[PDB]
Design a binder for this molecule. Structure first.
Ligand SMILES: *[C@@H]1O[C@H](CO)[C@@H](O[C@@H]2O[C@H](CO)[C@@H](O)[C@H](O)[C@H]2NC(C)=O)[C@H](O)[C@H]1NC(C)=O
Ligand SMILES: CC(=O)N[C@@H]1[C@@H](O)[C@H](O)[C@@H](CO)O[C@H]1O
Ligand SMILES: CC(=O)N[C@@H]1[C@@H](O)[C@H](O)[C@@H](CO)O[C@H]1O
Ligand SMILES: CC(=O)N[C@@H]1[C@@H](O)[C@H](O)[C@@H](CO)O[C@H]1O
Ligand SMILES: CC(=O)N[C@@H]1[C@@H](O)[C@H](O)[C@@H](CO)O[C@H]1O
Ligand SMILES: *[C@@H]1O[C@H](CO)[C@@H](O)[C@H](O)[C@H]1NC(C)=O
Ligand SMILES: *[C@@H]1O[C@H](CO)[C@@H](O)[C@H](O)[C@H]1NC(C)=O
Ligand SMILES: *[C@@H]1O[C@H](CO)[C@@H](O)[C@H](O)[C@H]1NC(C)=O
Ligand SMILES: *[C@@H]1O[C@H](CO)[C@@H](O)[C@H](O)[C@H]1NC(C)=O
Ligand SMILES: *[C@@H]1O[C@H](CO)[C@@H](O)[C@H](O)[C@H]1NC(C)=O
Ligand SMILES: *[C@@H]1O[C@H](CO)[C@@H](O)[C@H](O)[C@H]1NC(C)=O
Lengths: 49, 262, 383, 48, 37, 48
């Protein structure tokens, strides 16, 4: 009926606590916002199911 | 003083299975409750170790050191006393000596001229008490480099009990200019075979020696010829590159392992 | 404020009714801590660089370095060096680090050949007499020595190898003076047709042009973060403090977290410990040998609950998966990415299984669910 | 293909320009590791 | 099934974020609320 | 965007330090070609 609601932060995962890596990550645009959104859509759907 | 102890019996070399013995902590890192996988020079599980005695018997040949060696001795009175390691042994290059005398351990690297049939000697002759008396090992050591010694002690030079009470295990590697020693002690009550079971070897010492090792031979304890040699034995296995899975327990000690290619 | 952060996240001046994600919070470190092994011996670089005589490029001198403070900035800030090129560090960073072991190699080479020393190069130096490993960590330091050992007939003591059967392995040494066979013929004896003595000499006279002149090379090479470190830069250590978030550095393990007395039973030879995730979770202080558990200092997702812009500017903040005893710890005496902080005044703080909710009145009524928090909790806007 | 897989161990060792080529390797590979995981999870969520 | 869940929960009941950025969120309905439905 | 698609030609033409950067491009492009195929197969598998 469901699976474990797992949310990964794409910034924490790629660049954990580095502001240098975070400044570089911004050059790729929306991919981390899009990946956090995609996982949040899966997490909301577990309650719906 | 160098001399040939030719008063010894002639038989072929014995062999036996290693079982799951010959595992050591692969890096100086703590882990606990983890199934870690590592690639390193290990003794392959259930491999043929060769087997050697001093008893009538004085099995002290020069053996290859290819990729480093597991050495283990079933022991009484402390007959196994050290090892010589090198690439020539006849003064033309450096070589490494380890000796445990009755007092303190010595480790040395030099361009040694070793004796062909070396040993350490203990006297009981009409004195009712074992006393250390002889060392026959090398004639000369000129261009000497790495010097090390223990703080001093006294070990036992006596014992005539039945089954071997002591197993002493060692692993030696000559890698990236370091001669790494791993070693471990266990009591056992067993007569003529390596104990089946599992236990890891901890790193004993890290020696910055740099020198080529290609072969090695072992120094045992013992009117210049003819003698009594007490009953003691050692097993030799060669390490190989393998992948191992290691169960670190809740204390962070390795309690079991799997050889991934067995 | 948290509402304007949702407006900014959703790209709208009106945010609809719901629970929304925002920036994660993370208690920033208060101060740095440095803990290098307490020693005092300054390293023997003097007789490496300012040495009497220098080995050949086939017989390169290796000197090991240990148990000492290496102020590499004293080398790097000299004007004397023509090259100081480094392959897994930047030359400014060398002081910020400790090393497991170090080898200085040394030789003198012609000035046109110094380009061959770099890792994974090719040419008669790089192929047959001195090869750096293809993943080398270290520095190659080079300078002209013409007025230190050139001789006007020539210093014919400097030799190099032109002939070798197969390319040597990295850091391999070859002293052989055996004769080399170029053609199909055997060549026992000291010489013959297409047989070669494999060593040739440099014309080091002080007259020669640059590129033909003799150049002094050192290779500093060193290994990292897998043993109790023996060499360190002069970075002063500092007093060790616990339970507060800090930028720690133990022997070059730079990180951020809280230190605490661990119960971990490290054996006497271990200096670092690691998690199931293989990240380093514990360290043994190199000065006063106790085992401290490196814990990541408190952080997590932050979520904002709103009845919708049309109805109210009230919002409640869910700190996801953290006990809010760690929200007062986020006092503005140190930084966080969430620069806003008025909710901390409290009186409507509610711990939930989902994390801690601030700015919402907990009630003993159970209504129908409206905005879903998790673990059976919901929130809504009502009297 | 970067000098390390540990991000602080790059920023400790190098400078503000030599590091970025190494950090961008880790950003590229990690981001691909998330893009992979999220695709497996979206396809999984559709099956659940 | 909890003999499998408890492995996942300790590897990854106030669940909290790990340093790799993994977070396990609670369901909206507790196992007590699913039992009551 | 490597100099060639033939894996052994790059290894023959270039030296071991430059050829590693050419093989980095082939590995990355092929691995994207495989990830594309396996993602397309997973979407097809869900439809079947
Ligand atoms: C021990 O016996 C061996 C022979 O079994 C002797 O070894 C020879 O030593 C001479 C030099 O003294 C060499 O020219 C020979 O080639 C060696 N023979 C072998 C087979 O290697 C050795 O000299 C004897 N040593 C003592 C102290 O008696
Ligand atoms: C305290 C003691 O006896 N030390 C000796 C040492 O003098 C000797 O040089 C060495 C070589 O056998 O053995 C040990
Ligand atoms: C790393 C190294 O130089 N090892 C050498 C080996 O090549 C040589 O065969 C042996 C005896 O010749 O001595 C040792
Ligand atoms: C803070 C610290 O541990 N300082 C030590 C000191 O305790 C010790 O007496 C001295 C000599 O070993 O070295 C330093
Ligand atoms: C409770 C209430 O009145 N809600 C209002 C709604 O009536 C209005 O139509 C809308 C647009 O202004 O904003 C909101
Ligand atoms: C051990 O080696 C001998 C040959 O020296 C061989 O006959 C024997 O089969 C080997 N042992 C095993 C377990 O195969
Ligand atoms: C007896 O052993 C002791 C050991 O100290 C020694 O001094 C003594 O010379 C020995 N005597 C004989 C006859 O062996
Ligand atoms: C090594 O020993 C030989 C013989 O004594 C000598 O010719 C050589 O110079 C020595 N080397 C050193 C470094 O002392
Ligand atoms: C080590 O683990 C064993 C097995 O659980 C346990 O008996 C022992 O108490 C542990 N060691 C310590 C110091 O607690
Ligand atoms: C070399 O020696 C001179 C003094 O003779 C000194 O000025 C210089 O700093 C030294 N360089 C190094 C690397 O020790
Ligand atoms: C909710 O009920 C508990 C008793 O179950 C009581 O202690 C608490 O004060 C009540 N809170 C409110 C807001 O009524």
């Amino acid at each position: 009926v469901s699976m474990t609601k797992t949310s990964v932060d794409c910034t924490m995962y790629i660049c954990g606590d580095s502001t240098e890596c975070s400044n570089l990550l911004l050059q790729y645009g929306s991919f981390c916002t899009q990946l956090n959104r995609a996982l949040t859509g899966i997490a909301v759907e577990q309650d719906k199911n | 003083q160098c001399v040939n102890l030719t008063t010894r019996t002639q038989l072929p070399p014995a062999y036996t299975n290693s079982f799951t013995r010959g595992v050591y902590y692969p890096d100086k890192v703590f882990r606990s409750s983890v199934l870690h996988s590592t690639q390193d020079l290990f003794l392959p599980f259930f491999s043929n170790v060769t087997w050697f005695h001093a008893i009538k018997r004085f099995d002290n040949p020069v053996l290859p050191f290819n990729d480093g060696v597991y050495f283990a001795s079933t022991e009484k009175s402390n007959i196994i006393r050290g090892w010589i390691f090198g690439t020539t042994l006849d003064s033309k290059t450096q070589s490494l000596l380890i000796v445990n005398n009755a007092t303190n351990v010595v480790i040395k690297v030099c361009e040694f001229q070793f004796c062909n049939d070396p040993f350490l000697g203990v006297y009981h002759k009409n004195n009712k008490s074992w006393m250390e008396s002889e060392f026959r090992v090398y004639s000369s050591a000129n261009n000497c480099t790495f010097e090390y010694v223990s703080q001093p002690f006294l070990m036992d030079l006596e014992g005539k009990q039945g089954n071997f009470k002591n197993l002493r295990e060692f692993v030696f590697k000559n890698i990236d200019g370091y001669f790494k020693i791993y070693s471990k002690h266990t009591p056992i009550n067993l007569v003529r075979d390596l104990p089946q079971g599992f236990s890891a070897l901890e790193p004993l010492v890290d020696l910055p020696i740099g020198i080529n090792i290609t072969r090695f031979q072992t120094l045992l304890a013992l009117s210049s010829s003819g003698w009594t040699a007490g009953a003691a034995a050692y097993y030799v296995g060669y390490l190989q590159p393998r992948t191992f899975l290691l169960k670190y327990n809740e204390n962070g000690t390795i309690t079991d392992a799997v050889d991934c290619a067995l | 404020d948290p509402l304007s952060e949702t407006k900014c996240t959703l790209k709208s001046f009106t945010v609809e009714k719901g629970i929304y994600q925002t920036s994660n919070f993370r208690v920033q470190p208060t101060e740095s801590i440095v803990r290098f092994p307490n020693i005092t011996n300054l390293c023997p670089f003097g007789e490496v660089f300012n040495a009497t005589r220098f080995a050949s490029v086939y017989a390169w001198n290796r000197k090991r370095i240990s148990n000492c403070v290496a102020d590499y900035s004293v080398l790097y800030n000299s004007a004397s060096f023509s090259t100081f090129k480094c392959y897994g560090v930047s030359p400014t960073k060398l002081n910020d680090l400790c090393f497991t072991n170090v080898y200085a190699d040394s030789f003198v080479i012609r000035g046109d050949e110094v380009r061959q020393i770099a890792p994974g190069q090719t040419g008669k130096i790089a192929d047959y007499n001195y090869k750096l490993p293809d993943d080398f960590t270290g520095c190659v330091i080079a300078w002209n020595s013409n007025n230190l050992d050139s001789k006007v007939g020539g210093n014919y003591n400097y030799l190099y190898r032109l002939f070798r059967k197969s390319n040597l392995k990295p850091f391999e040494r070859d002293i052989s003076t055996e004769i080399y066979q170029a053609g199909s013929t055997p060549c026992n004896g000291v010489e013959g047709f297409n047989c070669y003595f494999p060593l040739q000499s440099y014309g080091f006279q002080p007259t020669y042009g640059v590129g033909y002149q003799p150049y002094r090379v050192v290779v500093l090479s060193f290994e990292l973060l897998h043993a109790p470190a023996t060499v360190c830069g002069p970075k002063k250590s500092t007093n060790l403090v616990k339970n507060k978030c800090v930028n720690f550095n133990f022997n070059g393990l730079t990180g951020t977290g809280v230190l605490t007395e661990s119960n971990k039973k490290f054996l006497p030879f271990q200096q670092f410990g690691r998690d199931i995730d293989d990240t380093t979770d514990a360290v043994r202080d190199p000065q006063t040998l106790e085992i401290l558990d490196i814990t990541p200092c408190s952080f997590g997702g932050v979520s904002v609950i709103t009845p919708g812009t049309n109805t109210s500017n009230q919002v409640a903040v869910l700190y996801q998966g953290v006990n809010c005893t760690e929200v007062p710890v986020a006092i503005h005496a140190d930084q966080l990415t969430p620069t806003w902080r008025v909710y901390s005044t409290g009186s409507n703080v509610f711990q939930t299984r989902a994390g801690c909710l601030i700015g919402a009145e907990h009630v003993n009524n159970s209504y129908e669910c409206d905005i879903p928090i998790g673990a059976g909790i919901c929130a809504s806007y009502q009297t | 293909g970067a000098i390390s897989s540990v991000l602080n161990d790059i920023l400790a060792r190098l400078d503000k320009v030599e590091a970025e080529v190494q950090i961008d390797r880790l950003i590229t590979g990690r981001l691909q590791s998330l893009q992979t995981y999220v695709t497996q999870q979206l396809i999984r969520a559709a099956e659940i | 099934v909890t003999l499998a869940d408890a492995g996942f929960i300790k590897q990854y009941l106030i669940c909290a974020q790990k340093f790799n950025g993994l977070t396990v969120l609670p369901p909206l309905l507790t196992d007590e609320m699913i039992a009551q439905y």
